[PDB]
Amino acid sequence: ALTKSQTDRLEVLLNPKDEISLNSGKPFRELESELLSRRKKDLQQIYAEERENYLGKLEREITRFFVDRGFLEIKSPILIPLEYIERMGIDNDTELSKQIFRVDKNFCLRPMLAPNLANYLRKLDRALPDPIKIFEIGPCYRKESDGKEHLEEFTMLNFCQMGSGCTRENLESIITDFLNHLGIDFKIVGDSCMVFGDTLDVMHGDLELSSAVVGPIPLDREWGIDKPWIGAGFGLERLLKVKHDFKNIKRAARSESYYNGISTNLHH
Amino acid sequence: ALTKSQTDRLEVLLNPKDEISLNSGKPFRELESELLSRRKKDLQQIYAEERENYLGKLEREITRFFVDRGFLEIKSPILIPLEYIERMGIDNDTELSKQIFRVDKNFCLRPMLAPNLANYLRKLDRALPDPIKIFEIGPCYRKESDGKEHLEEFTMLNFCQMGSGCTRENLESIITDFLNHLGIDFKIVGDSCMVFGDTLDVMHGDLELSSAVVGPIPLDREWGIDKPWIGAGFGLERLLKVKHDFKNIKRAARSESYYNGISTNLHH
Ligand SMILES: Nc1ncnc2c1ncn2[C@@H]1O[C@H](COP(=O)(O)OP(=O)(O)NP(=O)(O)O)[C@@H](O)[C@H]1O
Numbered sequence: 408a409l410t411k412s413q414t415d416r417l418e419v420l421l422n423p424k425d426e427i428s429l430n431s432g433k434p435f436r437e438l439e440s441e442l443l444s445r446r447k448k449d450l451q452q453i454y455a456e457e458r459e460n461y462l463g464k465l466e467r468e469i470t471r472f473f474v475d476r477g478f479l480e481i482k483s484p485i486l487i488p489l490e491y492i493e494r495m496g497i498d499n500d501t502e503l504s505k506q507i508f509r510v511d512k513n514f515c516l517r518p519m520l521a522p523n524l525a526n527y528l529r530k531l532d533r534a535l536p537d538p539i540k541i542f543e544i545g546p547c548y549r550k551e552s553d554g555k556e557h558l559e560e561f562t563m564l565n566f567c568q569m570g571s572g573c574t575r576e577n578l579e580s581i582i583t584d585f586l587n588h589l590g591i592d593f594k595i596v597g598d599s600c601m602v603f604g605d606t607l608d609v610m611h612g613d614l615e616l617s618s619a620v621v622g623p624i625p626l627d628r629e630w631g632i633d634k635p636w637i638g639a640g641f642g643l644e645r646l647l648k649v650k651h652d653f654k655n656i657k658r659a660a661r662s663e664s665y666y667n668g669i670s671t672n673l674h675h
Numbered sequence: 676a677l678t679k680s681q682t683d684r685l686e687v688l689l690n691p692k693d694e695i696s697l698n699s700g701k702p703f704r705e706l707e708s709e710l711l712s713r714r715k716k717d718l719q720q721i722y723a724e725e726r727e728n729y730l731g732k733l734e735r736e737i738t739r740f741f742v743d744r745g746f747l748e749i750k751s752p753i754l755i756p757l758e759y760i761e762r763m764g765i766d767n768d769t770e771l772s773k774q775i776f777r778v779d780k781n782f783c784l785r786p787m788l789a790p791n792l793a794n795y796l797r798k799l800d801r802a803l804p805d806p807i808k809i810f811e812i813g814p815c816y817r818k819e820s821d822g823k824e825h826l827e828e829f830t831m832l833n834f835c836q837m838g839s840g841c842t843r844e845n846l847e848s849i850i851t852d853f854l855n856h857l858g859i860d861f862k863i864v865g866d867s868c869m870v871f872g873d874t875l876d877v878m879h880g881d882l883e884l885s886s887a888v889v890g891p892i893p894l895d896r897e898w899g900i901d902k903p904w905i906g907a908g909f910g911l912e913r914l915l916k917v918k919h920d921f922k923n924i925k926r927a928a929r930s931e932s933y934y935n936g937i938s939t940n941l942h943h
């Protein structure tokens with residue numbers, strides 16, 4: 408019989424690669440020591456072999472996928488004006504606004520990539536041929552209640568296309584090719600949100616990997632966009648969670664407590 | 676004769692690839708139109724060819740360099756406790772503390788990677804063989820006066836080694852191999868700072884690319900580090916500035932105003 412604290416300690420040392428079946432009759436210390444040795448070995452293997460961080464590696468794989476398929480790689484600011492949020496229709500008397508990490512009086516950590524990419528679509532329309540295809544991967548921030556599927560600091564992919572080819576069929580096709588490339592099964596369910604209207608939610612079981620939108624939408628007017636567009640936002644830690652069978656998304660996050668899903672707290 | 680506003684407009688449309696020699700007798704509008712066409716062509720070329728963001732690409736090239744040479748890739752939080760900063764010796768009655776982007780009462784956007792990597796060195800010492808070699812690339816944040824060599828939102832590389840091989844000669848050798856790989860000439864000048872003590876500053880002309888440290892140092896005690904170590908921090912936008920001959924570092928930054936050093940504001 409273990410205390411909750413003991414159970415918690417073993418849980419954090421366990422990994423999806425471990426056998427989780429029976430309760431052992433071994434004392435807590437012996438169980439802890441066994442899992443510590445396993446996790447040290449896992450880190451030694453990573454160090455000897457690839458030495459890549461799984462979140463970094465996924466970001467690189469996703470980057471290559473989109474660049475090879477004609478999408479321009481964007482790197483825009485993480486710190487953005489609060490005004491961008493207001494202009495997405497998220498005023499400060501909305502429940503959604505409560506999730507915003509404010510920085511000084513007028514700025515915030517971006518909770519999404521959409522405003523930045525809207526600006527890029529509008530600007531690039533003056534230079535690029537049809538269709539315009541762009542994407543960004545990077546940090547986004549939301550205040551969240553503690554949960555196994557949510558992080559306050561996470562990583563978003565957003566791709567979008569503007570001009571011709573902006574149909575629901577093409578959007579679903581891009582999503583399908585993308586998740587097929589990552590080896591992730593999914594289904595599409597129609598849903599909606601107040602910022603974008605109707606959406607296509609990309610689900611793995613009960614876990615939302617992405618929400619996708621077929622534009623145009625009325626909100627486009629506030630961003631100087633007047634062409635059809637399609638786009639989708641994906642959480643990289645969620646993609647990693649599914650790929651590696653992590654139960655808690657914290658295993659997939661930027662962290663000092665987990666590295667590639669392995670506890671970094673390997674003292675007794 | 677141009678107004679300052681007209682001069683500013685042409686400056687932002689000019690690129691290092693442009694010929695800057697004489698004053699043209701053409702009217703401002705004609706000059707603007709010519710540079711607009713050039714910058715559109717530049718974006719069209721990027722879109723047709725590589726489609727990579729120069730800052731992203733540099734980050735990938737640097738990642739590959741360090742991973743191939745036995746350094747573990749770290750991805751740690753960008754949002755960190757203010758306490759980490761205090762424990763680097765930067766209390767709130769210091770001038771340096773004025774540069775910190777605070778987030779809520781107890782957190783900040785990291786101005787440096789050192790505390791996070793110190794934690795990783797201490798933790799990884801329980802698992803990895805000698806020497807322990809790690810690195811991280813990612814966003815860092817400092818309040819700065821407006822300058823051509825400083826950004827508020829920038830990107831740092833920090834590498835470090837711990838255990839054997841932690842000599843000044845090896846540190847300089849790693850730096851030399853690294854900048855030789857990037858095709859950047861530099862010199863080393865001894866200097867110091869109050870956080871780390873004496874440093875080796877990696878200079879390209881009068882521009883600081885990096886500061887490097889040969890440990891151990893007294894501060895190690897506050898971080899649970901008791902082995903020799905060496906390390907260096909580099910600004911990626913500064914490396915890009917030198918590589919591409921950008922006069923203003925804003926051309927190298929995460930931005931909605933510049934893409935690969937090219938103005939995104941291509942209206943008349
Ligand atoms: N706090 C978070 N932590 C991790 N990933 C997130 C978080 N919020 C959103 N995402 C991811 O970003 C994608 C697009 O964001 P968005 O459509 O705003 O999410 P959402 O509707 O708030 N999803 P959810 O919080 O699961 O109900 C989501 O499908 C997730 O994959």
Ligand SMILES: Nc1ncnc2c1ncn2[C@@H]1O[C@H](COP(=O)(O)OP(=O)(O)NP(=O)(O)O)[C@@H](O)[C@H]1O
Nearest residue numbers: 817819824825826829883884885886908909910913
């Ligand atoms: N505000 C900034 N913008 C861009 N790069 C920066 C900035 N601050 C630091 N760096 C880079 O990060 C490296 C390591 O940081 P650090 O040693 O703290 O810089 P520093 O001593 O403040 N340099 P400086 O501000 O040029 O006098 C520097 O050598 C730069 O290449």
Ligand SMILES: [Mg+2]
Nearest residue numbers: 506549551557
């Ligand atoms: Mg949510």
Ligand SMILES: [Mg+2]
Nearest residue numbers: 608615617618
């Ligand atoms: Mg959604």
Ligand SMILES: [Mg+2]
Nearest residue numbers: 774817819825
């Ligand atoms: Mg400085």
Ligand SMILES: [Mg+2]
Nearest residue numbers: 876883885886
């Ligand atoms: Mg320095």
